[PDB]
Design a protein around this ligand. Sequence first.
Ligand SMILES: Nc1ccc(C(=O)c2ccc(-c3ccc(S(N)(=O)=O)cc3)cc2)cc1
Ligand SMILES: [Zn+2]
Length: 261
Amino acid sequence: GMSHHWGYGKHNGPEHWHKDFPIAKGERQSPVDIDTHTAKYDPSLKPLSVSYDQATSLRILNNGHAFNVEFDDSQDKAVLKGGPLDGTYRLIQFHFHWGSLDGQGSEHTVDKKKYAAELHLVHWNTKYGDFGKAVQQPDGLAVLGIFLKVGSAKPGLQKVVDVLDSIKTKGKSADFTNFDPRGLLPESLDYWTYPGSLTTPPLLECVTWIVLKEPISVSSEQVLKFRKLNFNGEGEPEELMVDNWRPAQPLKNRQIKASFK
Ligand SMILES: Nc1ccc(C(=O)c2ccc(-c3ccc(S(N)(=O)=O)cc3)cc2)cc1
Ligand SMILES: [Zn+2]
């Protein structure tokens, strides 16, 4: 991706992506608007299983598009299974998408409602051996999406907020061990699920999306720190990292299933 030039600006944003990534106009693109009245309860869906007890984080990186909290996925730890999934998916990283204002920022929307941000916990299907091979498969990844609204602070998110000062610009990373992703989960695991794609280039259609119905609350101060990050690298004109979200895409030939009635 040494020659990629996509971003979220007026000349390289989502509406431009299809030129270098034609799959952008594909049959199973993400995100999508979740029409709560049309999503059908599927009694066959099994309970979701999120086992993060042994998760081991290693580093946090500003990649110029968002910041990723990376995990050591060399061993069978931090796994997502159950729900609509067959097999076991291993946690590799999580990141967020957010807005310049509290009124926008999420990628998925609920009955057209936009949340202030959206957390993505990315997992890859162990049957494919590694992350790189998994993204080349239709059932290669499982991304758990969690909406963020502004209200009370999320204690579990503060460690992340405080380390952002050290990775302000593109390319910067910092040691980030012992971060517990369980602190970012809402109480309920009720969810909607549908087949989709990565929401940023290469936009590969390799994701089983599992979006939780219950948002988590974060404080205004916490999301304000997210907005102080930079898309640019050190020594370059400052472009605040805000509105790094892709808008809802056509649902086309797909059905969104609900795990609850
Ligand atoms: N064959 C490949 C190997 C690695 C890669 C990547 O480096 C890569 C980059 C970004 C992503 C990615 C992951 C999650 C999301 S999201 N926002 O839908 O959760 C977006 C992009 C996936 C793979 C792509 C193709
Ligand atoms: Zn994402």
